[PDB]
Design a protein around this ligand. Sequence first.
Ligand code: CO
Ligand code: CO
Ligand code: CO
Ligand code: CO
Lengths: 324, 324
Amino acid sequence: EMVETVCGPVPVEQLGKTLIHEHFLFGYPGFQGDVTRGTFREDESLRVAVEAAEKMKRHGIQTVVDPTPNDCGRNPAFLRRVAEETGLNIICATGYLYEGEGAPPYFQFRRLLGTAEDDIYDMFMAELTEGIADTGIKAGVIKLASSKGRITEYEKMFFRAAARAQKETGAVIITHTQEGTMGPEQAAYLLEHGADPKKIVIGHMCGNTDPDYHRKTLAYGVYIAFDRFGIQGMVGAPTDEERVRTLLALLRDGYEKQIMLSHDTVNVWLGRPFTLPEPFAEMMKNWHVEHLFVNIIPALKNEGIRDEVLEQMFIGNPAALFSA
Amino acid sequence: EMVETVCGPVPVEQLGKTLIHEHFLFGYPGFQGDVTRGTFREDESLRVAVEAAEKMKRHGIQTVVDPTPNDCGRNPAFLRRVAEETGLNIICATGYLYEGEGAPPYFQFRRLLGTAEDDIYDMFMAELTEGIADTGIKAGVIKLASSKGRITEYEKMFFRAAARAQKETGAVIITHTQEGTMGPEQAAYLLEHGADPKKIVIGHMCGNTDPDYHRKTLAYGVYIAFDRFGIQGMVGAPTDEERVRTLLALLRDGYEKQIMLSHDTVNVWLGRPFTLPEPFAEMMKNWHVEHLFVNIIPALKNEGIRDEVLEQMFIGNPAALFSA
Ligand SMILES: [Co+2]
Ligand SMILES: [Co+2]
Ligand SMILES: [Co+2]
Ligand SMILES: [Co+2]
């Protein structure tokens, strides 16, 4: 009946309207080494993060799941500061990013020692049931990630440890898929290791534009996330128009009880500030926390998507996800 | 005349006996994510670090170059506390590890922006001439690293930036070579971009057992470092017996003014504590800061190496390296 937030245990029935995948703070592994020229502005970062939290509250959002990985500058105490100020429910994660964009050398070394999987399991259990560092904050979700075209041996260690921790705690698993690949394989690998499909969210599914690929993943009984609305412009990556077109094809087939939507925003970047190039910046202009409510939902309503369907995705599914 | 230490500028003539490559603190990238089970205890880490520094002092060591990379838990403030407690001169570095064992995602993203090399150069200049993070502590060396059998495009950015910074500051470059590869390639590439050979130390050269490989590197007029004494057991790393055999061959060939010696010890490991298996631990038993003086030096002196030659490597070469 309860889920661990950055402000302690909160009743699952009181979560309400939820964004399943947003980042208040995020940095690419290695940002720590650029501290001299990319200093952390704590007061300014809080101001921007609270501003983003207030923007979501104006659209009826009461809960945000922040799946910032452990190796990507996850800061539970900072998230608590945002939540204590706004009253917004924030659920943080425990886990690492995939091999290509994470920081693997540490657990790759423990893999050589032959304790890595047990060490990761131990980390998951400690952060889910005891607390993260000395913050007293317990993670409410386990974050997993896989590479493009394959789930690597490094990544599989985390997948097996998450499945073990999932059986012991009943925690929710949120995943990262790279470039619309490994969706069905993630679900398959987790289930055969004992994980509950009703507690798994396969993320970044909007990265694939083939409805058959989605149906194959949805066949496992898992949740899928169209969580990257706003991110477009890359040569291989899909557009928001292609995302909606894929979403409408699944809502026609009646998969609403298994679909959730988000933006995957990075509200405050860790490390040195940057500016996107002229063509890319224009294509990424819609990448903000209000995009779904201002642009996407009205476009869905014009296609004939009912309010009950939208409320099932934003309110119903998160409530069913965190419930035992 | 002067060199930047963690306590400020120190006369190069006062550096005395120096260990060119030792780590007081070190963590594999990703250690930050294991904060709950691998918390950094500053006070007990300082005790172990001071204990290591005092063991160096037993053998007349007055200066240590600590080339811990930015992405490997480099902590100049901690090193300052070690230096103040012991009276030891500690020179720290600016730089990142190689692609395979470092944290590349951050500066790989900045390459997509097209500013990475300039950003890295800017970082080098800041930390060599202005101060690291929230301190006035300046780095005294630039740390570079390459992969096995290749200097990757990612790595080449740091090499080009280092050569640029070297030309403008006169700073020392110290390198990491992976598994006895790329020694000549590193020297050649640095000199292509205008770096001063008398200011370059090609590291981990003991990882190769072919004297011709060393002579190819030495022909560039650079320093080479037999800096991993004590590290044995792994494929395909050499034994201390093989290191000594290679070292003796070069010393008898008259290369003493280009050679420096170290252990590459990690005195305090960042992250979760670990234990090596007994067959591996027995092979690594001599990996400590006293090894060169208690085991290697008496073995060298029995093989005809005079105290003057030893003092040339430990005192003369570091003095010449840091001098204009
Ligand atoms: Co992701
Ligand atoms: Co994300
Ligand atoms: Co090294
Ligand atoms: Co080293």
